[PDB]
Design a protein around this ligand. Sequence first.
Ligand SMILES: [Zn+2]
Ligand SMILES: [Zn+2]
Ligand SMILES: [Zn+2]
Lengths: 263, 65, 114, 46, 89
Amino acid sequence: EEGPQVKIREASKDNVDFILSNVDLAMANSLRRVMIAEIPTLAIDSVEVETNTTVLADEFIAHRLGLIPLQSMDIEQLEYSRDCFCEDHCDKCSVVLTLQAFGESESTTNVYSKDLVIVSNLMGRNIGHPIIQDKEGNGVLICKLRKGQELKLTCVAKKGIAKEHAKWGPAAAIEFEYDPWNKLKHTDYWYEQDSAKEWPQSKNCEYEDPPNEGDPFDYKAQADTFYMNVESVGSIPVDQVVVRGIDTLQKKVASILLALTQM
Amino acid sequence: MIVPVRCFSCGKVVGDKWESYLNLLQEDELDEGTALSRLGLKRYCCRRMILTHVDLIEKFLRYNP
Amino acid sequence: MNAPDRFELFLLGEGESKLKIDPDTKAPNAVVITFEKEDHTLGNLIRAELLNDRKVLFAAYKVEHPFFARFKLRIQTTEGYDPKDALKNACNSIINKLGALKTNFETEWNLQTL
Amino acid sequence: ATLKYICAECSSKLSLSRTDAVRCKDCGHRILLKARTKRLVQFEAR
Amino acid sequence: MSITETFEKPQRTNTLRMKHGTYDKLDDDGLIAPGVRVSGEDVIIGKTTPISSKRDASTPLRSTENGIVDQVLVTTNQDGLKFVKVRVR
Ligand SMILES: [Zn+2]
Ligand SMILES: [Zn+2]
Ligand SMILES: [Zn+2]
């Protein structure tokens, strides 16, 4: 469809190894940054501690809670708490969850993220569900209790972005490479005896044509064709991270044309 | 204290693989390296996260008060 | 304690506008736009695009201090060509370019088996 | 109802004022802990 | 002789000797309880002293510090004195 060009190599519920082509490095890189820091998501951002006899401090547990990946499928149908016209929080802008655990058995009692319970009305939108990916349906191990120890909390999820705090980040890592063959000469290889022999060859060198001995430096060739690979943290489908990233960046660029308008 | 929820460097959820790492060692008698790799942890930043953890809560739990 | 809030990185404080346009004196047909609550993501993007336009004599961006979230965009264009227009042409060219990418992706994503 | 002070070892809830010495019941320990307040504490999950 | 000190909430009487802090967090036993958040120059240990009616002898939290009361201990010395230890997290 003319313009940017996607060419997926791998795909799954966790990673999207693809190949952006026919685009400026800037755009490629801008998208890379947006996926990392500006894609809306839901995450614990308030914890009320009623009972805590655990070996961990409140802020310690609180901190971890906020790091628990939460379902953010329909995150767009959840207003930012700072915008919402209510007082503090409500179902229109926040998801409330509870955690109640008691050291009953004699063996250590594990408090996972599955033990979290939504207490607010989700209104039918896929949101707030603690993400689970372990072959045991336990999820993230929040804390541990000895017989007698108790923990009664109340978390208030909220929509946020990574820029404000990494917890709100939907992405994990983002492989990024271009010109596996240093034809553009964007880098000067360090060596002892042999540049090529000492430097490991990249995966993407296969997906490209090795330079030819005689050909003089192609001083016009620019930087297009970037070999990426996104990895979702779970709060959002892998493909979504990309798509929504592309969309978010698109919004920013638009928020500026609108500024020129009312200017 | 306990398995950090995410890896400091990339954020990849790692705080949901402690018990698995442990079993992969005792029950399956696998070596640390071969174990972390089977947990999807390929980049040394995530690998170190688990391989270097110290589950001090176990000893903490050993107190009564 | 002295550290500013995190939202200030993307939220405009009171008495602030997303764009500040001023006439450059060092040269004709030049402007210096101050983008508030934005960083390298936009600066280098709109910058790279403004460069594809041949009727654009000058385009550069810089964040004067990493503590604050804002950057300056300076543009120079041929007589008759308004700099505020090159920014429009660039923005639109981006939005379109990105839109096409969003489509090409949601397509290739379908032809996948996993 | 209530639980002003708590014992260090037996963890048995105590509660007394002045002239009431500074011990606990059964356990002659003289430590005692303040016991967490009821006013719920809020936290930034950051 | 008969000149003791008492852990409690002082609110001025014939002396007006207190400090620029805020005793609004001490319980009647003159001690904040675990869970309470303390900062600024708040009073952690309110105490009085009648010199021969109320002269402030209370321990305020450190200035450039601020956290949450992690624990309070009320013991007795080897002689018999009443001891107080407030751990702030
Ligand atoms: Zn609301
Ligand atoms: Zn990592
Ligand atoms: Zn006792």
